[PDB]
Design a protein around this ligand. Structure first.
Ligand code: HEM
Ligand code: HEM
Ligand SMILES: NC(=O)C(c1ccccc1)(c1ccccc1)[C@@H]1CCN(CCc2ccc3c(c2)CCO3)C1
Ligand SMILES: NC(=O)C(c1ccccc1)(c1ccccc1)[C@@H]1CCN(CCc2ccc3c(c2)CCO3)C1
Lengths: 453, 453
């Protein structure tokens, strides 16, 4: 089981010696992030390891990262590593490959523009009101608040409503049909990465890592609203009634599902990360709350243009994403033999960009382990390399919902800080530790005290 | 197990209704050829069926065949369907895909030219002398001759000698090390086509459909002759010491092995097919023997330029290949969604050209089941469509050893007909029947009487 296990030794590329069949997966016992920082420290700018028999080439040179993510995206590095068994979710944009992804990116792009986001803000604002009343409830109880529930309820509230046009107080309504389905769906893989040779077997088995009932539920659910108002689902329906063939009925369901996966636990974790940093830095929480009340006096409701007016809110969000890039890694499959910036890359290799390691690299960040929003001040922001700081990826296949995610979090933070201050309690994990999973998340959930202003 | 089994029903393309998981493979019980002729008769110009869950789209329009084989070869239809587990034989030109095949086709092309073939004829001639003395031995015994042994011994003689630079009277020397290895190698697949989802499993199993000892044998065997004369092996070594990277040591072994597979049973079967047609048509055998003795009086030895002088020999060979195209089918994988000659072809579909069916189509061939070499006379040959008659494929990925194969067979036929006449005996399968396997071969071996002129 050492096929390809001599690839990096042949290329002269350093890296940890793999074991037969397993590759270097045993080193993942301390997590992706610790493994990336160690390899970066041990082997320098480039190194290779094996997910089972799959060679993975890590790169850290920003010139080389730009070549992979931007310049050679369409011709060489178009796709992420295969993920399955997907079934009909093969039509999702994040799973699609080559021309099929290229077409999906074109049809969905006008839906994620600045203009469309401003027309969705009044919807996001309503769920912000739900977040505040769900928070002040647990605030009544002096007993501390585990944020992942009230924030996860908010994160799922917005993302499924926008993606499917429904309305739910998901916390106070565990009964709505569009809730229980989305709940078991968002509960989420191993040997599919270590042993990806089984995926074709798993596919023909009719196996779907997505539950079979939820997918059949959402399909008939979207067909319900065909018989008919500014949401992801609605903006995609308008794209059908328009070059590329329009989004099919099944493709449309695939995109709405993939938006919930890319948006639920991602937003919920960053919101818990942000509030942990604001609780352990009262001055930053004070300076932020003072900015919100200046832009929005008398607890004025937030709007699209006022959110972009809050520079310190943008600095706090960006600095949290540097410390906690929940994707941890960016990956591209080398579709054909190429040489970039004076280095040969063999066809089939997975090229990985260790975002977590690069975000905490002392060579680019003074005291990289400290939460310091002034790194993103208008003075100091010009020194940050866009290919070192990559919380939303980069190039033509970056996070297409990036603008929305930032708006959605900022809108939640404004509505929460306008009403509450946040302090740590005796059970808050200080220092916070990271869980060893496929998304960067706090090891133990963030528990904080929530006082009412 | 009906994924993709609704593809042709959706496209409106006719074809036999598949069974779950199996597809249409049960219809293969009477062979590829009978199944292709029936579908052609039943459904007309185009139809689709399923090798398991693999959609196969059959086309018969010569304009559309030209588009697939020639015009859209490099951009859409570059590859045959996957074949494995191959191991290091992935570097063989017939197995290689996309740019890797494109490079191999360039490096090997100058080796299969008209000029190089003329320099190999003196080597092929020697094994022709071995064929005659091996034939006159069984001719001494009035007992009939099973041709597949004396011809198979000749076919393996030439193809392995040219591909590896050795010399063997393989019939009279079952002791030479380069014989027993080539023998067990040439003895040769099922669910790899019906259930190709297992190939990745079989690969990581370290399974090699090629025996593990023979491959390790030939590698050290080629390295023996590195320490050093007009053969395939020698012409490839000269290509290394020369744009594309040169043939590696392992790639060179892969090509020499793939030449033996493409050349042994193919040549041996056509030679048995040809001699069956000459035995059951004494006038054609007479007219051919009269041509050989006019071009080559006094049983003169054949040369390169005299072989191309024998038009009737070329007509007999070509007419045998129409009746018996041992590949039976040409196949290309549609690498991306395309429309050709007003018909949509989905990505991933296997496009198949039913050569056997087209060669016996009454719409192009008057009495297509009769052996009639005059179809290829200088008068009548202009009416034959090169995309209907495709015994060696067509386009940039056709049989690269085509010129050699025709020369090798013609040289054997000249040397055999100069000495012997061939008549059927009471055990000759008349009418000959075809075996139901992956290569077109006589059901029962051809047994004939061999008189000495
Ligand atoms: C804090 C929130 C989020 C973070 C940190 C995040 C991060 C990322 C990252 C790193 C990628 C891969 C980029 C690359 O490989 O270059 C990605 C892809 C993607 N994200 Fe986000 N994401 C967030 C929220 C969202 C939301 C709310 C949506 C809503 C639609 C979304 C939709 C997508 C999609 C569709 C892709 C795949 C794009 C493609 O393959 O073309 N994400 N995300
Ligand atoms: C009567 C003898 C032969 C017949 C009928 C025959 C037939 C064929 C056919 C139909 C193909 C596929 C063409 C296509 O898909 O368009 C092929 C491919 C090939 N043949 Fe032959 N063949 C014969 C002898 C030989 C010999 C003696 C060699 C010696 C090297 C050879 C080497 C090859 C190779 C390397 C390929 C693969 C070409 C590629 O994939 O680029 N063949 N053959
Ligand atoms: N299509 C894909 O490969 C996925 C994807 C990966 C990175 C960015 C976007 C999308 C995906 C599959 C299915 C559902 C959601 C996401 C991969 C396949 C396995 N990995 C597991 C979980 C995951 C990892 C990173 C991450 C996200 C999810 C969202 C943004 O980053 C997600
Ligand atoms: N590379 C390939 O796909 C092969 C190939 C197929 C058609 C033309 C050329 C090559 C091959 C694989 C391994 C060894 C020899 C040939 C295929 C894979 C399975 N099929 C089985 C036997 C076979 C079928 C048709 C035929 C030949 C061999 C030689 C010319 O036609 C051969």
């Amino acid at each position: 089981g050492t096929h390809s296990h001599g690839l990096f030794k042949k290329l002269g590329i350093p890296g940890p010696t793999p074991l037969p069949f397993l590759g270097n997966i045993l080193s993942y016992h301390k997590g992706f992030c610790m493994f990336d920082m160690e390899c970066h420290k041990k082997y320098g700018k480039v190194w290779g390891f094996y997910d089972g028999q799959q060679p993975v080439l890590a790169i850290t040179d920003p010139d080389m990262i730009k070549t992979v993510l931007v310049k050679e995206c369409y011709s060489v590095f178009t796709n992420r590593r295969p993920f399955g068994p997907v079934g009909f979710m093969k039509s999702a944009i994040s799973i699609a490959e080559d021309e099929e992804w290229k077409r999906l990116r074109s049809l969905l792009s006008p839906t994620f523009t600045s203009g469309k986001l401003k027309e969705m803000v009044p919807i996001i604002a309503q769920y912000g009101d739900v977040l505040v009343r769900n928070l002040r409830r647990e605030a009544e109880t002096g007993k501390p608040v585990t944020l992942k529930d009230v924030f996860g309820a908010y994160s799922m509230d917005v993302i499924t409503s926008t993606s499917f046009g429904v309305n739910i107080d998901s916390l106070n309504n565990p009964q709505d049909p569009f809730v229980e389905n989305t709940k078991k769906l968002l509960r989420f893989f191993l040997s599919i990465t270590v042993f990806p040779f089984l995926i074709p077997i798993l596919e023909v088995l009719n196996i779907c890592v997505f539950p079979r009932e939820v997918t059949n539920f959402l399909r008939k659910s979207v067909k319900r609203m065909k018989e008919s108002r500014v949401d992801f689902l609605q903006l995609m329906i308008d794209s059908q009634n328009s070059s590329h063939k329009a989004l099919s009925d099944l493709e449309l369901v695939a995109q709405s599902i993939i938006f919930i996966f890319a948006g639920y636990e991602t937003t919920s974790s960053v919101l818990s990360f942000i509030m942990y940093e604001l609780a352990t830095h009262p001055d930053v929480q004070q300076k932020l709350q003072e900015e919100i009340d200046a832009v929005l006096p008398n607890k004025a409701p937030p709007t699209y243009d006022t959110v972009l007016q809050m520079e310190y809110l943008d600095m706090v969000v960006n600095e949290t994403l540097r410390l906690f890039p929940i994707a941890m890694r960016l990956e591209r499959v080398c579709k054909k033999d190429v040489e970039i910036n004076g280095m040969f890359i063999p066809k089939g290799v997975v090229v990985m960009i260790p975002s977590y390691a690069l975000h905490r690299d002392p060579k680019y960040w003074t005291e990289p382990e400290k939460f310091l929003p002034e790194r993103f001040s208008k003075k100091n922001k010009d020194n940050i390399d866009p290919y070192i700081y990559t919380p939303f990826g980069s190039g033509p296949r970056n996070c297409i919902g990036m603008r929305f995610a930032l708006m959605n979090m900022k809108l939640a933070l404004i509505r929460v800080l306008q009403n509450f201050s946040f302090k740590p309690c005796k059970e808050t994990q200080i220092p916070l530790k990271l869980s060893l999973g496929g998304l960067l998340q706090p090891e133990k959930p963030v528990v904080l005290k929530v006082e009412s202003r």
